[PDB]
Amino acid sequence: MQAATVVINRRALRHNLQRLRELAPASKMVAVVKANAYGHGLLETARTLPDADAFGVARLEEALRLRAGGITKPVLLLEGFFDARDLPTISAQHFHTAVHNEEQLAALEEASLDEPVTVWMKLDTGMHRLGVRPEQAEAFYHRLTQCKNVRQPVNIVSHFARADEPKCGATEKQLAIFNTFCEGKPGQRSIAASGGILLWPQSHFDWVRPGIILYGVSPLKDRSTGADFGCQPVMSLTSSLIAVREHKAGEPVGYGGTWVSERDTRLGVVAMGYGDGYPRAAPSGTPVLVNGREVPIVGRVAMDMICVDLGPQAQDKAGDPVILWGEGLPVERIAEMTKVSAYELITRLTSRVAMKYVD
Amino acid sequence: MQAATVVINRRALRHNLQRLRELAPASKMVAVVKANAYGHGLLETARTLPDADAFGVARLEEALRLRAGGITKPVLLLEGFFDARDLPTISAQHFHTAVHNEEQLAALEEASLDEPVTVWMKLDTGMHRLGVRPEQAEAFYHRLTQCKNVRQPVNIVSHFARADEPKCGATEKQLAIFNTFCEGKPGQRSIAASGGILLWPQSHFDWVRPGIILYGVSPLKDRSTGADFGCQPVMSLTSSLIAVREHKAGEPVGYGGTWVSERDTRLGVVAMGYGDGYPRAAPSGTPVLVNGREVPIVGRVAMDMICVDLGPQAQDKAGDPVILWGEGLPVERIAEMTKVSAYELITRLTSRVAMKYVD
Ligand SMILES: *Cc1c(COP(=O)(O)O)cnc(C)c1O
Ligand SMILES: *Cc1c(COP(=O)(O)O)cnc(C)c1O
């Protein structure tokens, strides 16, 4: 049969990069493809977007994998490098890096490289995750402009912690801090990711870093989907039924007897579970498409299977197509129903899912 | 590798199979290695247990991977085959299969194979997931004994839905149904997995199918660990700190400003997130080991990073060892703290996580 599979629409991917250029017309694009391109495939997603100005990754491993696959464009290390002994590779690879701590800076200062490296000084403007705090940033910044090993000018990067919450003044505060530090400095400026791109046009600056919305999924947490912004969904989590069985009123289904039927019906069993990446937290009632038709999940999601209520004379058959999320069913709707973030849903999938690419 | 890594103890693995043979002394062992051996690695886990009587998998694809890697023991297709055109491979590969529906049985009836196949009729004794219902089982069973394509005798398999809940009579009822159907029939009997093995010695029969407990993790949600049964934990989810930063009181951390500090302190940033498989649901306060000392997670788990509270004058530094779970921190503690099942924690990890094998 066909069991568990992720179908990636290359056409929708292309459409979204172009659509985002329309939303941030004066900014270059850093296609964020970390974590296996949000579950869509690191290398294939990069090869689908040869138009991207650059690619962003979390770790050095991911960037090197890109070069190994023949990706040639600039890759930004969003978290910088974790070992000073990596600088020579970074330099030779032409990898651009963020610099947020003393270790990285002192490494830049003492290293001996055949070529200087393009750098983005990570500023802490409010997220308090990575980055140099304001009161340390000027001195830190000045040391970078004095590096032989750093291409000039030093670029400045930062990230929003609550851009999806327009009513709290978090973003405007980070923007205030970002703007104060960049005054009078050359070099490119970057602080906007999906949220900043869609909701804050003041934060576009020179480079924007689309991640989730690049895949046609909304970064917000209203019921909004990628189509609210003209972005098309790229991923479809699919599978097939491996059984259609009779069931009777009063009888429970799955582990823990979580769901009990109030009527004689027919249950379908899907070749999909959390061993594939489908949330074990999915409550009975969560929507799933069987032969194009919404049916509810009944009972606890197991490691390899999911049961759905088809109906007493439902004519579904072992073999028939199932869509966990996809065309007809945005991953957002599954996020709302299961209470799991769309970011995690599309990303926390296992190596057992097979990967298809269409268009 | 200094970042997301799963360290697998080959020797705790061996200890657990033998310890399970001591707990179920009159039953053969079906080492369940579905879903990439519960996150531990399908092929490596099989190669570590050349003593296993058989291996259990969810899908055909997994069994073929085992043959591809050189694994030669009998492999049991727990859900059977999804396509009739698969019987020829299954026969030739010497795969044993479950048979739960009409399609599979009719396939066996009219296939033409060079060799007959060993079969385990799946009986639905209460789980209502896969299997032939009691009232249809006798006729279905009889057709399998009349099959020239099926190696006689027909074996009988079933699975418990609530064996981890000794107080409800669910297990005794399934056992009652299982026993009634098996009366007078030859062929091996099997109904027990981890729970049945540890809590129900009257369900051991001929073959037991250890899954989660084989990896030294408890099946129950009673706070018990694998060590409660003499089983040693096999997996250690590890990483490293990529930053140690100053923080001030009243300042929030991570997306959504989820956590706010009541004191000046130092925060550590871990190269671990849900893009690796770590639960995004992990609440602030969840334990992590930094330099073998427990510190709490503060703020939201992100796709690639985790922040932890180290203390004001704490001397941990970027590069230092971090343990998400393993040696001084059982995955069962993390499950309780995050309210995520240990089954899902160890299994729903991504391909971003490196794999190490020790001993
Ligand atoms: C992952 C990440 C992004 C992308 O964010 P989205 O909300 O998914 O668009 C951009 N920049 C940095 C620093 C990141 O770590
Ligand atoms: C996966 C499974 C098992 C093993 O279960 P554990 O709870 O990890 O012990 C055994 N038998 C069947 C039918 C299964 O699907």
Say yes or no for a CB contact (<8 Å) between B3 and A271: no
Correct CATH for B10-217 of 3.20.20.10, 3.40.640.10, 3.30.300.20, 3.40.50.720: 3.20.20.10
**A7, β-bridge pairs:** A236, A356
**Cα A170 to Cα A162: distance, rounded to the nearest angstrom:** 6
SS3 call for B66: helix
Contact B164, B221 (CB under 8 A): yes
**Cα B34 to Cα A271: distance, rounded to the nearest angstrom:** 13
Residue type, B31: A
**Cα B51 to Cα A351: distance, rounded to the nearest angstrom:** 27
Exposure string over B285-320, b if 16+ CB within 10 A, otherwise e: ebbbbbbeeebbbbbbbbbbbbbbbbeeebebbbeb
**Cα B35 to Cα B58: distance, rounded to the nearest angstrom:** 7
Contact B66, B36 (CB under 8 A): no
B303 is in an annotated binding site: yes
**B260, β-bridge pairs:** B252
Phi and psi dihedrals of A354, rounded to 5?
Answer: -90, 145
Best A244, A245, A278 member to test B by mutation, with max B CBs in 10 Å, is A245
SS3 call for B220: coil
**Cα A191 to Cα A177: distance, rounded to the nearest angstrom:** 11
Distance of CA A64 to the CA centre of its chain: 19
**Cα A155 to Cα A144: distance, rounded to the nearest angstrom:** 10
Contact A325, A237 (CB under 8 A): yes
Kindly state the DSSP code that residue B229 receives in the 8-state scheme: G
**Cα B188 to Cα B39: distance, rounded to the nearest angstrom:** 29
**Cα A221 to Cα A225: distance, rounded to the nearest angstrom:** 9
Ligand 2: centre distance to CA B200 (Å):
15
**Cα B199 to Cα B174: distance, rounded to the nearest angstrom:** 15
Hey, what are B60's tokens? 């055909």
User: Torsion angle, CA of A42/A48/A50/A51, rounded to 10 degrees?
Assistant: -110
Other beta carbons within 10 Å of A249: 10
In Å, what is the CA distance from B196 to each residue of B54, B80, B131, B162, B333? 18, 22, 18, 9, 23
Kindly state the DSSP code that residue A125 receives in the 8-state scheme: S
Correct CATH for B1-9+218-359 of 3.90.340.10, 3.40.50.10800, 1.20.120.350, 2.40.37.10: 2.40.37.10
**Cα A234 to Cα B122: distance, rounded to the nearest angstrom:** 38
**Cα A215 to Cα B165: distance, rounded to the nearest angstrom:** 43
Q: Resolution limit in angstroms?
A: 2.6
**Cα B224 to Cα B242: distance, rounded to the nearest angstrom:** 33
Kindly state the DSSP code that residue A31 receives in the 8-state scheme: E
**Cα B324 to Cα A79: distance, rounded to the nearest angstrom:** 20
Task: Give the list of residues 6+ apart from residue A172 with CB closer than 8 angstroms, or none.
Answer: none
**Cα A3 to Cα B64: distance, rounded to the nearest angstrom:** 15
A212 lines ligand 1 (CB under 6 A): yes
Instruction: Name residues 44-63 of chain B within 8 A of A (Cβ).
Output: 58-59, 61-62
A327 at B interface, C-beta within 8 A:
no
Backbone φ/ψ region at A285: left (φ over 0), alpha (ψ -120 to 50), beta:
left
* B124 HSE (CA, 13 A, CB side): 24
Hey, what are B51's tokens? 């003593």
Ligand 2: centre distance to CA B159 (Å):
8
Ligand 1: centre distance to CA A210 (Å):
7
Domain boundaries, chain B: 1-9+218-359, 10-217
Residue A356 CB burial class (10 angstroms; 0-12, 13-18, ≥19): middle
Say yes or no for a CB contact (<8 Å) between A341 and B280: yes
Residue type, A46: A
**Cα A98 to Cα B127: distance, rounded to the nearest angstrom:** 53
Residue of chain A whose alpha carbon sits nearest to that of B221: A256
B9 lines ligand 2 (CB under 6 A): no
Shortest Cα–Cα distance, A219 to chain B (Å):
12
In Å, what is the CA distance from B209 to each residue of A21, A51, B63? 55, 52, 16
**Cα B241 to Cα A100: distance, rounded to the nearest angstrom:** 13
**Cα B279 to Cα B287: distance, rounded to the nearest angstrom:** 13
Best A83, A221, A242 member to test B by mutation, with max B CBs in 10 Å, is A242
Other beta carbons within 10 Å of A7: 17
**Cα A199 to Cα A174: distance, rounded to the nearest angstrom:** 15
A78 Cα nearest atom in ligand 1: 13
SS3 call for B304: coil
Hey, what are B54's tokens? 């058989």
A80 lines ligand 1 (CB under 6 A): no
**A120, β-bridge pairs:** A98, A155
Phi and psi dihedrals of A85, rounded to 5?
Answer: -70, 0
B193 lines ligand 2 (CB under 6 A): yes
| Among A78, A95, A94, A87, CA closest to A35 | A78
Best B159, B242, B301 member to test A by mutation, with max A CBs in 10 Å, is B242
Ligand 2: centre distance to CA A356 (Å):
29
- Closest partner residue to B280 (CB to CB) among A126, A299, A344 is A344
Residue type, A169: G
Hey, what are A56's tokens? 């962003």
Exposure string over B193-225, b if 16+ CB within 10 A, otherwise e: bbbbbbbbeebbbebbbbbbbbbbbbbbeeeeb
Say yes or no for a CB contact (<8 Å) between B255 and A127: yes
B321 at A interface, C-beta within 8 A:
no
Backbone φ/ψ region at B357: left (φ over 0), alpha (ψ -120 to 50), beta:
beta
**Cα B327 to Cα B289: distance, rounded to the nearest angstrom:** 10
**Cα A277 to Cα A274: distance, rounded to the nearest angstrom:** 4
What are the catalytic residues of A? 34, 255
| Among A252, A236, A259, A226, CA closest to A322 | A236
Question: Among positive and negative, which fits the CA dihedral A272, A273, A277, A278?
Answer: positive
